[PDB]
Amino acid sequence: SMDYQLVQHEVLCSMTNTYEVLEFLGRGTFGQVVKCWKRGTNEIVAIKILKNHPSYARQGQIEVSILARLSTESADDYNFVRAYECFQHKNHTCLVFEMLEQNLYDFLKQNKFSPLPLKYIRPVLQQVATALMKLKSLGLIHADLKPENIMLVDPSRQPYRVKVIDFGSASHVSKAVCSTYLQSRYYRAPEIILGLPFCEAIDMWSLGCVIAELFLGWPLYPGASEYDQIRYISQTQGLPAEYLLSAGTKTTRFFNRDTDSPYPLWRLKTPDDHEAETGIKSKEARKYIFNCLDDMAQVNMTTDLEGSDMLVEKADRREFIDLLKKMLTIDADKRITPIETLNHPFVTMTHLLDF
Numbered sequence: 001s002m003d004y005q006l007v008q009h010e011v012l013c014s015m016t017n018t019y020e021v022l023e024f025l026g027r028g029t030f031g032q033v034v035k036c037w038k039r040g041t042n043e044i045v046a047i048k049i050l051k052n053h054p055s056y057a058r059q060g061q062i063e064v065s066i067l068a069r070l071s072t073e074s075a076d077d078y079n080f081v082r083a084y085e086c087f088q089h090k091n092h093t094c095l096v097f098e099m100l101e102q103n104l105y106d107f108l109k110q111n112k113f114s115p116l117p118l119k120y121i122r123p124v125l126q127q128v129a130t131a132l133m134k135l136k137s138l139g140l141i142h143a144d145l146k147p148e149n150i151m152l153v154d155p156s157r158q159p160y161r162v163k164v165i166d167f168g169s170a171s172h173v174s175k176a177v178c179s180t181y182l183q184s185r186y187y188r189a190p191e192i193i194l195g196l197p198f199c200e201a202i203d204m205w206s207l208g209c210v211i212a213e214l215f216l217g218w219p220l221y222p223g224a225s226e227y228d229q230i231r232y233i234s235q236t237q238g239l240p241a242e243y244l245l246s247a248g249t250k251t252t253r254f255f256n257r258d259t260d261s262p263y264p265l266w267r268l269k270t271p272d273d274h275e276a277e278t279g280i281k282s283k284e285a286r287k288y289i290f291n292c293l294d295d296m297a298q299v300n301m302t303t304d305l306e307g308s309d310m311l312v313e314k315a316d317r318r319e320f321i322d323l324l325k326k327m328l329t330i331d332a333d334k335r336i337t338p339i340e341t342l343n344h345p346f347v348t349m350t351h352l353l354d355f
């Protein structure tokens, strides 16, 4: 229908190159990704075919332009997917990319959703943080940072080497209206849930969510709904400060003023009450429930580690949970920046130089 009918050995012809399709890789919201041979060479490329509908075309245009703007000496050094050229094929916008093998969700699934050791998280974090730092420097917001939009180039030959993909939803800071609906729910920053002003800082929330997921091998805050998403956060991290709630355009979707402002007593709607007045049922969707983020320090501790090698782990976790809290700071103004994360002990390993 909206999805171009895949053809058994289709020839996708741009103006400078021609491409043979080898493998249908799957379909997403944007469209489908197909593995292709670049005729008369030895290189294999991923080609994103967007849906026929005009909207997607802008999304591709948006993405195209940002990749156009991000076309420079090296995407490789700042760990975002190399885009090559954009072309039309039967009322279909097609984008050519470097082939990438596996997103972090697929990887985790392959690993039976067992937690990733911190020593393999670290490089991933470094790369994504680096990407974010580049984005900031261009005043860009990615706005869909999530496991499926971080892809391992080639896990076997290049362990833990990642590219950020999909700049379809990306955006300049100068254009960021309050109470815009952005981000995958699990990776959505409070400032979007509550309808507060926002910027590149939202991506840092997503990054925190991603690294916690990796640590746990399951999402930290898997809300079925914005109500659930904010309830979960609130349980673990406390209610967002009054000043945040009072300013949010969406606050009263989820919270009541139990006393009149000024100095209002904000309380989360009870799940029951919420259900009553919305027609949305509250679920319990999470494998791990934490009274605070500190308690993450102690879960899934290896029971097969002696002396110095457990001390190291203890140290490492402490550094991790310290960065994670900074990343998952509800007020964006107080939230750690990419550069700061890059100079945090957990990344730089300064905390391990004496073992």
Ligand SMILES: CC(C)(C)c1ccc(-c2coc3ccc(-c4cn[nH]c4)nc23)cc1
Pocket (backbone or CB within 6 Å): 025, 026, 027, 028, 033, 046, 048, 081, 097, 098, 099, 100, 101, 148, 165, 166, 167
């Ligand atoms: C099946 C599904 C939808 C999860 C998927 C997604 C991406 C890819 C993919 C494989 O290599 C790629 C290279 C670039 C991109 C891309 C997506 N945006 N912007 C770039 N995507 C890919 C393969 C499968």
